[PDB]
Amino acid sequence: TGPLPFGNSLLKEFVLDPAYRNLNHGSFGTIPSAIQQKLRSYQTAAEARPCPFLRYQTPVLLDESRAAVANLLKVPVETVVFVANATMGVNTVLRNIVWSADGKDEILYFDTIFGACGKTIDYVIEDKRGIVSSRCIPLIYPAEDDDVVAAFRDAIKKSREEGKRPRLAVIDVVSSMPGVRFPFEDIVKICKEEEIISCVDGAQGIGMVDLKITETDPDFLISNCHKWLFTPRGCAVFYVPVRNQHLIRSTLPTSHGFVPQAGNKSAFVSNFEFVGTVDNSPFFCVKDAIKWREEVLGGEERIMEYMTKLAREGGQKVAEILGTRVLENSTGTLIRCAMVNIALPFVVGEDPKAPVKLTEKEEKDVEGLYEIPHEEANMAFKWMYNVLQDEFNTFVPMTFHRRRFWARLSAQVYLEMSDFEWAGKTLKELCERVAKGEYK
Amino acid sequence: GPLPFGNSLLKEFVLDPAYRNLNHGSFGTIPSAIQQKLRSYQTAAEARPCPFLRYQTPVLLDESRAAVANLLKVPVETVVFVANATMGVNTVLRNIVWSADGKDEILYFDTIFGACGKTIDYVIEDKRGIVSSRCIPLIYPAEDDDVVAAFRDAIKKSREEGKRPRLAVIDVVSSMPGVRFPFEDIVKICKEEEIISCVDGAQGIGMVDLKITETDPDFLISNCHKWLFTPRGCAVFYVPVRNQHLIRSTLPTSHGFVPQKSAFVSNFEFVGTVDNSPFFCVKDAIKWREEVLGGEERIMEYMTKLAREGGQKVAEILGTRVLENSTGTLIRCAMVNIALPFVVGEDPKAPVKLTEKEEKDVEGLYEIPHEEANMAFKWMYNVLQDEFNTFVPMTFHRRRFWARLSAQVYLEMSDFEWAGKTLKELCERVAKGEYK
Ligand SMILES: C[N+](C)(C)[C@@H](Cc1c[nH]c(SO)n1)C(=O)O
Numbered sequence A: 001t002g003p004l005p006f007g008n009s010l011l012k013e014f015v016l017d018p019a020y021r022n023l024n025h026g027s028f029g030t031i032p033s034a035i036q037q038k039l040r041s042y043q044t045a046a047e048a049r050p051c052p053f054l055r056y057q058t059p060v061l062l063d064e065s066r067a068a069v070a071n072l073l074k075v076p077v078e079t080v081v082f083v084a085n086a087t088m089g090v091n092t093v094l095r096n097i098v099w100s101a102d103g104k105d106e107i108l109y110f111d112t113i114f115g116a117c118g119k120t121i122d123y124v125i126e127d128k129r130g131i132v133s134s135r136c137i138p139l140i141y142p143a144e145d146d147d148v149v150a151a152f153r154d155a156i157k158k159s160r161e162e163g164k165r166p167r168l169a170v171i172d173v174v175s176s177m178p179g180v181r182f183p184f185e186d187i188v189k190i191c192k193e194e195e196i197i198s199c200v201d202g203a204q205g206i207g208m209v210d211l212k213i214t215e216t217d218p219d220f221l222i223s224n225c226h227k228w229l230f231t232p233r234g235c236a237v238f239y240v241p242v243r244n245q246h247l248i249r250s251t252l253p254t255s256h257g258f259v260p261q262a263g264n265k266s267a268f269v270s271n272f273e274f275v276g277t278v279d280n281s282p283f284f285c286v287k288d289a290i291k292w293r294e295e296v297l298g299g300e301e302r303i304m305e306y307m308t309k310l311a312r313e314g315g316q317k318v319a320e321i322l323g324t325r326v327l328e329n330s331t332g333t334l335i336r337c338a339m340v341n342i343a344l345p346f347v348v349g350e351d352p353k354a355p356v357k358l359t360e361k362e363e364k365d366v367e368g369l370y371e372i373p374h375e376e377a378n379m380a381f382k383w384m385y386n387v388l389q390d391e392f393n394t395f396v397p398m399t400f401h402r403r404r405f406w407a408r409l410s411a412q413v414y415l416e417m418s419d420f421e422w423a424g425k426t427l428k429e430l431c432e433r434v435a436k437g438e439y440k
Numbered sequence B: 001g002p003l004p005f006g007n008s009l010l011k012e013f014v015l016d017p018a019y020r021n022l023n024h025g026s027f028g029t030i031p032s033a034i035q036q037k038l039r040s041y042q043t044a045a046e047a048r049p050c051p052f053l054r055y056q057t058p059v060l061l062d063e064s065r066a067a068v069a070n071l072l073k074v075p076v077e078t079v080v081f082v083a084n085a086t087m088g089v090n091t092v093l094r095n096i097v098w099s100a101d102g103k104d105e106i107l108y109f110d111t112i113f114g115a116c117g118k119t120i121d122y123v124i125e126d127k128r129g130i131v132s133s134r135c136i137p138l139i140y141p142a143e144d145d146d147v148v149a150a151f152r153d154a155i156k157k158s159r160e161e162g163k164r165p166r167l168a169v170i171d172v173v174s175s176m177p178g179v180r181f182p183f184e185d186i187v188k189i190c191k192e193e194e195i196i197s198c199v200d201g202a203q204g205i206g207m208v209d210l211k212i213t214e215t216d217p218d219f220l221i222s223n224c225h226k227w228l229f230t231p232r233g234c235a236v237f238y239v240p241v242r243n244q245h246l247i248r249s250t251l252p253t254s255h256g257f258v259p260q261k262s263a264f265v266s267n268f269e270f271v272g273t274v275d276n277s278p279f280f281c282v283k284d285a286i287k288w289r290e291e292v293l294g295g296e297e298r299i300m301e302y303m304t305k306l307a308r309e310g311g312q313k314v315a316e317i318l319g320t321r322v323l324e325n326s327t328g329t330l331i332r333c334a335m336v337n338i339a340l341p342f343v344v345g346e347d348p349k350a351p352v353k354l355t356e357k358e359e360k361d362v363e364g365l366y367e368i369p370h371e372e373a374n375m376a377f378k379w380m381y382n383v384l385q386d387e388f389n390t391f392v393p394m395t396f397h398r399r400r401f402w403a404r405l406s407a408q409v410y411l412e413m414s415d416f417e418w419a420g421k422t423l424k425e426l427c428e429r430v431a432k433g434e435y436k
Helices: A008-013 A033-048 A050-073 A086-094 A115-127 A145-161 A184-193 A242-247 A267-271 A286-295 A300-322 A360-366 A374-390 A417-435 B007-012 B032-047 B049-072 B085-093 B114-126 B144-160 B183-192 B263-267 B282-291 B296-318 B356-360 B370-386 B413-431
Strands: A080-083 A105-110 A133-137 A165-172 A197-201 A220-224 A236-239 A339-343 A398-400 A405-410 B079-082 B104-109 B132-136 B164-171 B196-200 B219-223 B235-238 B335-339 B342-344 B366-368 B394-397 B400-406
Touching: A033 A050, A033 A286, A033 B032, A050 A080, A050 A236, A050 A286, A080 A086, A086 A115, A086 A197, A086 A220, A086 A236, A105 A115, A105 A145, A115 A133, A133 A145, A145 A165, A145 A184, A165 A184, A184 A197, A286 A300, A300 A339, A300 A405, A300 A417, A374 A398, A374 A417, A405 A417, B032 B049, B032 B282, B049 B079, B049 B235, B049 B282, B079 B085, B085 B114, B085 B196, B085 B219, B085 B235, B104 B114, B104 B144, B114 B132, B132 B144, B144 B164, B144 B183, B164 B183, B183 B196, B282 B296, B296 B335, B296 B400, B296 B413, B342 B400, B342 B413, B366 B370, B366 B413, B370 B394, B370 B413, B400 B413
Parallel strands: A105 A133, A105 A165, A165 A197, A197 A220, B104 B132, B104 B164, B164 B196, B196 B219, B342 B366
Antiparallel strands: A080 A236, A220 A236, A339 A405, A398 A405, B079 B235, B219 B235, B335 B400, B394 B400
């Protein structure tokens, strides 16, 4: 005998509501029933002998999860620690960077940055008083990989032309909205060519795609284990190479491990073990999830290849149903993850305060589609979220990009092709309802 | 009706029957009925993730906020939930805009919690010296007037050096040692001197009356998971609406931040993806403590009365004393400190000249050399669990070790007699040099 087959037969191993269809695993993730049992096993041990377990078994269990995730990512264990989530990790980097005294440091970032990380940038500048500022790089999707590379090299060239210093850049592994594989290998590589700190936001990363940490060699990398590695909610892996760990002077929040102003566990690794009393049972389950995905399922590569294959083929099915298309570039490099974006068969029309000149391909593509007006776009956007939840018992996040709604579907090992055919209707049935102005 | 207190109440908890929890104040524990609430919220989250986590989270957060604000007798618009007390005080210190002249000073007492004290050090490092601090040393047993006078002088001395006392962090109940702190007198002085009163009340809710309305602090944090029978990883953050604008960003910064139901309350709903089931259980722990245990007033009345009579029993057994001032105001919480019957040799680099009463209380007592003080401290911690199946934190103060015992509603006098005999035999083996 061997690993379990994928598809709806795998739902027996999970704890989803059978009447609910989880097309949006990429937002909060979920865990199999066995990992939920492990999580409550750590809860039980924590309340049986609180002080003996929380004081001296927390470092032991953390080190077991650190060695389990480090071998998966194929990095030295001394380079990985656990934090609350991707939002927490990104702040740990941005709040710790000592900016140059001359006030020219600039944070380069793309306009598809996760909203929380973007607002973390906005405030870091407010709190740090304008010693640093930010330059947003507008990306146009579907985006060819070389055009993204070109726009980032153009932002550096422009930054220096205004006498400023591109200091740090945040880079997605897989972007949130739209759910798209980002060419982070090239942008990270040029960050070192131009001596720019690479802060890799890879929240949509571990468990879904190969992060290639040893090869890309980033200065910092964040990734949510609870998103695609079946780790309980509230866990991210924080990778820092030893050359740059001295820059993480304080954790978030500051705790006992901080040092103001031999030869065992490093002070960096020690500082992340106790950062305030929390439930660490999700951190403990990381070694269980990696074990379960390997022993019960085929392993990481068999998991990832199925999801990506299902994301392309299934995204293509809902695209052929709706009569639109998938979000993809000419190199086929955007759908290199478990998520896929499909355009909905209508448009919202020009907004006068912010007009959009679409390319010929985009205008040509919309010919014949039904058009609602722009005042009702936000109203229709909220109406589709409730109806999907209330009538259809599902959730589908949608990206509003250039007068098109792009639905983001996320494939997973407990899903199959019939789950997209169902997604085809619901989106098409519901899109037939917005054309009839039902949201009013 | 109300359940009786004592060892019979251990039925309702899920502690190891071989383990004696004398150390509730460190991490707390929850009854089984709150454990099944925690797992219910966890199960609802995994059943329908996006529908439950996006739209049922704010409703459940508001239900716990209404419950925790109703018990604090404060407006619901004043309270939000943060991860822990450490996270709460980091939210205050990391948001305060310090004066441009670089004269602002953070005032604190040397009994501050280590993480909170370390937070001051980093903030000073993070703000590149635009703000500094001043540590007020304290000697325990500390009379309330001496603490107030040490704070008044710190204010007077701060101004005499061209500095401005800007912010003071005040304990409701200190950690090590576990003592009720005269925060009411210190917060009132903070108002008169126009000093931000950042009240660290981690050892607070469920254990002592915080009298927030009377004291009217600028900020207050308190761990529900310590003494409110709330699952681990929960602290209630109180902010009056007059300073809510000072809290610019949560920790970490999330969607609710506004770059330059109120926005302050909304900003704390979604602050990075976490397990919020501990926050959701606050409403249930409060309701369980009301019906099953008989109400909030009855619980903390029993625990401190038990801490007094139990702490005195331990002191009688060891032949030493409880940590208490002449007013009897230190043991006004569910914790008590008892001196152990030995002494540490004088540290030659950091000599501590004892008062006459301190030196007479240590006469005839066995003495450990200071070079062995850390070795004996680690030995007692290992033996207390491996051989006695319990944990007792000890405060090293003025060449003495003070053991901090945490009273609880599931304990009774027989538990503190056990601790006294356990500690007596433990120190007898220390006197024999067993730690070598
Ligand atoms: C064991 N520990 C949680 C790391 C703490 C001990 C401790 C006691 N009480 C608390 S509550 O945050 N922590 C430390 O040693 O710094």
